[PDB]
From Swiss-Prot, chains A, B:
Residues with PTM N-acetylcysteine: 1
UniProt-recorded name of the protein: Fatty acid-binding protein, adipocyte
Modification sites for Phosphotyrosine: 19
Positions with a binding annotation for a fatty acid: 126-128
Length: 131, 131
């Protein structure tokens, strides 16, 4: 929502390759993804929130209503069911596929946007600043 | 053999966490191993070559005759069958366990010692200089 709207550029990443390993992403896609460093663009229109990621490798885009489950195809090409809710001022996303699940939390920290992704006890943290 | 004897200290590493992932090493051991940066000490006595790795985490040591298969327990605790031969001036090691195999090549490059480890198309390169 409002505090999230804008274009954000990646400043740092911790354990992202390890998170992708746990999600089962293959070596080549982990390599392209780790080189890509995508921007994040968030915008809101009525009750629909859009989150777009743009890079040379892949652009992704999801538009959703908070609290309504929807189909998402991830950058690493998983087809998942996602639900995003607003809790404690953070956007909390749960993605479920093949009996597995991962949580992606997007939260404000100071003037930054922090994305935390958790897959079975492995946590990755990516920090973004406004472009 | 002679060009290999001495104590060597790690200068750089490329793709080692990715190699350990392919060998099936778990997150915590990959983390301790990636932090450890072990020295390598090689010595020869008669027809027995000893290669020792020393770190805060684990010290490992193998003594072997070139061309004779032997039992090795790796730093990540796999129990493997190893054979090391001298080919083209490089020590070439093959480790086999549970129907899998990986090759570790130790070769001189200039004044450096280069260790290349290959597991199903993922290659890691570590470069050492004399201590």
């Amino acid at each position: 929502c409002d505090a999230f709207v804008g274009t954000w550029k990646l400043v740092s990443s911790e354990n992202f390759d390890d998170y992708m390993k746990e999600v089962g992403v293959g070596f080549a896609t982990r390599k392209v993804a780790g080189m890509a460093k995508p921007n994040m663009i968030i915008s809101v229109n009525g009750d629909l929130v859009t989150i777009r990621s743009e890079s040379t490798f892949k652009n992704t885009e999801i538009s959703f209503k908070l609290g309504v489950e929807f189909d998402e195809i991830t950058a690493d090409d998983r087809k998942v069911k996602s639900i995003i809710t607003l809790d404690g001022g953070a956007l909390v996303q749960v993605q479920k596929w093949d009996g597995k699940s991962t949580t992606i939390k997007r939260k404000r920290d100071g003037d930054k946007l922090v994305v935390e992704c958790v897959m079975k006890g492995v946590t990755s943290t990516r920090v973004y600043e406004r472009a």
